[PDB]
């Protein structure tokens, strides 16, 4: 963990590394940032005061008688975290253009497509016939092998 949320959000901006902040839980390991990496990232002069005052509070805690060590270089910090992100990750309006997939008999009037595969359903013959009676319907079929991967591919792509 790191001594402040400010550094965590700063490295979130720099790469996106989700790093937690110490909240007096356990005698854990703490990272700290000196003048070199502060000048590297460009943190405001306000945050240096907070980090140094936390460091001297830990100094007081040590004198009252917990591990703290510092990172010096960007490459060392990259090896320290052990992960580099994949930059942008946009999120769409919804997961799929299909909102509902069901089996009920009363919904065949409103249904618009159907996939078929050998299944143990007592009403599969009935629902398949009823869906096939429509004048313009979107019917897909299985060709053996793995049905789950095909259906998952179809439901992502449709």
């Amino acid at each position: 963990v790191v001594l402040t949320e400010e550094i965590a959000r700063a490295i979130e901006s720099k790469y996106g590394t989700k790093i937690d902040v110490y909240r007096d839980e356990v005698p854990a390991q703490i990272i700290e940032v000196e003048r070199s990496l502060q000048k590297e990232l460009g943190i405001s002069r306000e945050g240096v005061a907070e980090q140094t005052e936390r460091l001297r509070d830990l100094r007081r805690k040590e004198k009252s008688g917990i591990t703290i060590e510092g990172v010096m270089s960007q490459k060392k910090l990259l090896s320290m975290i052990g992960g580099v992100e994949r930059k942008m990750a946009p999120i769409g309006a919804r997961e799929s253009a299909v909102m509902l997939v069901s089996n009920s008999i009363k919904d065949v009037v409103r249904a618009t497509a159907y996939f078929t595969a050998p299944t143990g359903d007592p009403h599969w013959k009935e629902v398949a016939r009823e869906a096939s009676k429509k004048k313009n319907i979107l019917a897909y079929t299985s060709t053996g092998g793995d049905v789950k991967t095909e259906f998952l591919h179809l439901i992502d792509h449709l």
Partner: peptide, 30 residues
């Protein structure tokens, strides 16, 4: 648009359906 799928494959892939936030109506045939 909507789709009709067999109950067994819905029961097997219902985790993906709830992970993708899709709506389902199902009748368990015992």
């Amino acid at each position: 648009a909507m789709l009709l799928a067999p109950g067994d494959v819905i029961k097997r892939s219902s985790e993906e359906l709830k992970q993708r936030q899709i709506q389902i109506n199902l009748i368990d045939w015992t």
